């Protein structure tokens, strides 16, 4: 560790790829989010995990189109990139005005709707595609 | 004695049931009263977009 911190050759390399900042973050959110949604598929995901997979999708869906097929982000990604995460707020805040918390309620289990899974990756597939 | 038999022996076995009733209850609420897993907030509740 000591001959690696005084070592120049080790620093100017360092610099050379700190020129690549912003995809790193861009791709460790992919693993820090899919690590947070295979723990929400087992179920014990806190609330935080949740909303950190929401802002990946977000990040990666509205602020990463435009930060690799134009290299630059200005205008539009930023806007568009709040306004999902405005977007996706309502069926949060109604859910914790309108009730004692998040906690699911027994309910009917046929009254939710539920699709092949083939369906719905082929609809995620062709939203990410249009996007793109 | 001028004195026969009263209210029923149907009321008996109404009361009886009654009380046999609320016995197993609390019997069994006595047992299995707390087993608590877990509980998560369904803040990705997928049905309403997804
Ligand atoms: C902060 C959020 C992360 C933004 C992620 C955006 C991103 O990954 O964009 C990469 C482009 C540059 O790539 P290249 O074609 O220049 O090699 O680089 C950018 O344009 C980054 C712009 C970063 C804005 C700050």
């Known amino acids: 560790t000591l001959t690696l911190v005084l070592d120049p050759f080790f620093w100017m390399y360092f610099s050379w790829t700190w020129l690549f900042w912003p995809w790193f973050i861009a791709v460790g959110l992919a693993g820090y989010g899919i690590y947070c949604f295979r723990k929400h598929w087992l179920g014990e995901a806190n609330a935080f995990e949740q909303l950190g997979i929401v802002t990946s999708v977000f990040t990666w869906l509205t602020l990463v189109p435009p930060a690799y ?15 999902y995460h405005y977007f996706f707020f309502f069926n949060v805040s109604v859910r914790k005005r309108l009730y004692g918390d998040f906690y699911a309620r027994t309910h009917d289990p046929k009254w939710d709707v539920n699709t092949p899974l083939w369906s719905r990756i082929l609809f995620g597939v062709g939203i990410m595609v249009g996007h793109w | 004695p001028m004195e026969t038999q009263i209210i029923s022996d149907d009321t008996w076995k109404l009361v009886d049931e009654i009380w046999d009733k609320k016995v197993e209850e609390i019997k069994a609420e006595a047992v299995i009263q707390i087993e608590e897993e877990k509980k998560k907030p369904q803040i990705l509740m997928a049905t309403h977009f997804f």
Do not use: D
């Not at chain 1, 200005?74 to 709040?82: D, H, I, N, T």
């Open chain 1, 69 to 83: 097929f134009n290299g630059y982000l200005e205008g539009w990604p930023y806007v568009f990139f709040l306004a």
